[PDB]
Amino acid sequence: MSLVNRKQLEKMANVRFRTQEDEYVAILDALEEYHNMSENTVVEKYLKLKDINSLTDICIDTYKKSGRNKALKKFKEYLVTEVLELKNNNLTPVEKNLHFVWIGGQINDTAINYINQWKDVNSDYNVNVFYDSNAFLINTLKKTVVESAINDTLESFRENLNDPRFDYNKFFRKRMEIIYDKQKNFINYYKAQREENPELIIDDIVKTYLSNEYSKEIDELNTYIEESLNKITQNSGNDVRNFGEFKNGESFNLYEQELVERWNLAAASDILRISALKEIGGMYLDVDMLPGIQPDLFESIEKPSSVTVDFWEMTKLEAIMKYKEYIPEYTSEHFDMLDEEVQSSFESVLASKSDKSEIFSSLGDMEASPLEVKIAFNSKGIINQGLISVKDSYCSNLIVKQIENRYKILNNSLNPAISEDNDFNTTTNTFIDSIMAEANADNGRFMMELGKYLRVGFFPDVKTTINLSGPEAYAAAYQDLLMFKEGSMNIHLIEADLRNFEISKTNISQSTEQEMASLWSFDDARAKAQFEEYKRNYFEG
């Protein structure tokens, strides 16, 4: 399963009676010396593969009317196969680090209780829980602002709360306008202050703002900052403000854009996590992820037919937490819908086990390609809630580059829109017009997905983050890898290509309670339920 030799290819692209051009002879040359490269690093072999590819597309280019073009194009495919061979066969130890991120406010007990499960079965792994010591008040800032906007929109309706269609669609639309205006009022303040006193940290600007505009007590905010700092210190805290390579890189301004202006802590988390992986190596996990259940644990209990495979994965966890109680206040919602007979079997199995290690598996020694970042999977494809990479992996670099390039395209259209000082609607329309003018056949779908950006976290079903800093940057990077290029914007890879980068399902339990509620986004059914709750509160409060 090695790949084609110098004269093995030379008989493949043999065209009768016609001379061998310089750029063709370069392919063969580079190909032979690749086979003498069993001294070189895994990266050096990829870069030799990239170049053979860069010479082959340059041979075709110059000779559009060449008989070699059929074999020259079949060779380009053999090169892809070889990357996949280079990746799977040449594995190095993954650094024993677990990376979590919680930024924007205090860490809640739930996250720590999830994190501690990883701690309890991975004593040989170092754990970082990343926080930003300048920015404990963003979550407070957003919540105050959203609630102020909730109350203002309801003040607008009220005499029309009954009817007709002052429905949940209309509410979130109006609320968006108010939110935009408040956010832009804060952003303007932030920038006025940073220009005046460049020494002021995020939280200083924020608490002064909350005091001036929402009558919050600075003393209580200060107390909150001090408690949050103490709590994260007690829990493997690691400060973004001491991560120097991150502070000084080209992604820090983007990270702050998301933190300070957009209040999207998931997008800020996306930008930081890949950088942690690039700089330290190891395994990244969202705080709503729990260890993998032992393969042979529930092997005696059979999934009944009246149950989703995903319902079953949820119940497996809930049965562990009902009987072993590892995580307090874990839901039993789905477990309780089972039979007597089926609930009995779970207790009976969760009985013969005494150690947490008989329930949850350990990561132990892991290995990956110096080329790759491994990514978790769910039914909708790849997902960056789990990631594995060795320090300075080739992909970690390609993913960083993808994210920065995606932001460069966004900010190029967004910023001129914003720096005209208009309301939500006009700014949206200018922004979209601009995105539309810069769109082309290469970046089309991605551009369509960018136009909802001003609404992220504030309106139902707005997922822009996925295309900017999330899973799509990862797919683009894998395509960069497999196509010997950089800057893919048009994803043509299918499921089978991406499967090469999967973390095995046994290493993570993804079907957790906290996974089932998104911190940066919300669907329509949730938006409807929220609307109705807010009306009641307004009526009763």
Ligand X SMILES: OC[C@H]1O[C@H](O)[C@H](O)[C@@H](O)[C@@H]1O
Ligand Y SMILES: O=c1ccn([C@@H]2O[C@H](COP(=O)(O)OP(=O)(O)O)[C@@H](O)[C@H]2O)c(=O)[nH]1
520 touches ligand Y by CB under 6 A: yes
Nearer to ligand X, 118 or 209 (CB): 118
Q: Which of residues 363-402 bind ligand Y (CB under 6 A)?
A: 385
134 touches ligand X by CB under 6 A: no
Answer yes or no: is 102 a known binding residue. yes
Q: Is residue 231 a contact partner of residue 107, using CB atoms and an 8 Å limit? A: yes
From 88-96, 281-289, 391-399, 526-534, span contacting Mn ion (CB under 5 A): 281-289
Pairwise CA distance, residues 438 & 451, whole Å: 12
Nearer to Mn ion, 479 or 512 (CB): 512
Closest approach, Cβ 424 to ligand Y, in A, equals: 23
287 touches ligand Y by CB under 6 A: yes
Nearer to ligand Y, 132 or 480 (CB): 132
From 89-97, 284-292, 482-490, 500-508, span contacting ligand Y (CB under 6 A): 284-292
HSE toward the beta carbon, residue 283, CA cutoff 13 A: 28
From 101-109, 207-215, 229-237, 523-531, span contacting ligand Y (CB under 6 A): 101-109
What is the size of the binding site for ligand X (CB under 6 A)?
11
Q: Residue 43 carries which side chain, given as an amino acid letter?
A: V
Q: Is residue 335 a contact partner of residue 319, using CB atoms and an 8 Å limit? A: yes
Pairwise CA distance, residues 334 & 484, whole Å: 47
Of 128, 388, 515, 520, which one interacts with Mn ion (CB under 5 A)?
Answer: 515
HSE toward the beta carbon, residue 446, CA cutoff 13 A: 28
Pairwise CA distance, residues 541 & 158, whole Å: 13
519 binds, among ligand Y, Mn ion, ligand X, none (CB under 5 to 8 A by kind): ligand Y
Closest approach, Cβ 527 to Mn ion, in A, equals: 18
What is the size of the binding site for Mn ion (CB under 5 A)?
3
Nearer to ligand X, 451 or 471 (CB): 471
From 207-215, 265-273, 364-372, 526-534, span contacting ligand X (CB under 6 A): 265-273
Of 102, 125, 453, 534, which one interacts with ligand Y (CB under 6 A)?
Answer: 102
Pairwise CA distance, residues 102 & 136, whole Å: 10
Pairwise CA distance, residues 105 & 3, whole Å: 53
**Pairing of the two strands 367-368 and 92-93:** antiparallel
513 touches Mn ion by CB under 5 A: no
Q: Residue 172 carries which side chain, given as an amino acid letter?
A: F
Q: What residues contact residue 22 under an 8 Å CB cut-off, 6+ apart? A: none
384 binds, among Mn ion, ligand Y, ligand X, none (CB under 5 to 8 A by kind): ligand X
Q: Residue 3 carries which side chain, given as an amino acid letter?
A: L
Of 92, 500, 518, 530, which one interacts with ligand Y (CB under 6 A)?
Answer: 518
Answer yes or no: is 236 a known binding residue. no
DSSP annotation of 306 reads: T
Answer yes or no: is 271 a known binding residue. yes
104 touches ligand Y by CB under 6 A: yes
Pairwise CA distance, residues 101 & 275, whole Å: 12
Q: Is 356 helix (H, G, I), strand (E, B) or coil?
A: helix
Closest approach, Cβ 284 to ligand X, in A, equals: 9
519 touches ligand Y by CB under 6 A: yes
Tokens read off for 315 = 């119940």
Q: Which of residues 407-466 bind ligand X (CB under 6 A)?
A: 465-466
Q: Which residues of 509-526 are buried (b: 16+ CB within 10 A; e: fewer)?
A: bbbbbbbeeebbbbeeee
Answer yes or no: is 118 a known binding residue. no
Q: Is residue 105 a contact partner of residue 136, using CB atoms and an 8 Å limit? A: yes
149 touches ligand Y by CB under 6 A: no
Closest approach, Cβ 384 to ligand X, in A, equals: 5
- The answer to whether the peptide bond before residue 460 is cis (omega within 30 degrees of 0) is no
Q: Which residues are annotated as a binding site?
A: 101-103, 139, 269-273, 286-288, 515, 518-520
Give the residues lining the site for ligand Y (CB under 6 A): 101-104, 139, 265-266, 269, 286-288, 385, 518-520
